[PDB]
């Protein structure tokens, strides 16, 4: 989840998944 989920793809992790209560 780092270097590819905490910098660029994180967008689709803390902004998208977070929105849909993941």
Curated annotation (Swiss-Prot):
It is found in: Secreted, Extracellular space, Surface film. Pulmonary surfactant consists of 90% lipid and 10% protein. There are 4 surfactant-associated proteins: 2 collagenous, carbohydrate-binding glycoproteins (SP-A and SP-D) and 2 small hydrophobic proteins (SP-B and SP-C). Homodimer; disulfide-linked. It is linked to Pulmonary surfactant metabolism dysfunction 1: A rare lung disorder due to impaired surfactant homeostasis. It is characterized by alveolar filling with floccular material that stains positive using the periodic acid-Schiff method and is derived from surfactant phospholipids and protein components. Excessive lipoproteins accumulation in the alveoli results in severe respiratory distress. Respiratory distress syndrome in premature infants: A lung disease affecting usually premature newborn infants. It is characterized by deficient gas exchange, diffuse atelectasis, high-permeability lung edema and fibrin-rich alveolar deposits called 'hyaline membranes'. Pulmonary surfactant-associated proteins promote alveolar stability by lowering the surface tension at the air-liquid interface in the peripheral air spaces. SP-B increases the collapse pressure of palmitic acid to nearly 70 millinewtons per meter. This is Pulmonary surfactant-associated protein B. It comes from Homo sapiens (Human). The gene is SFTPB.
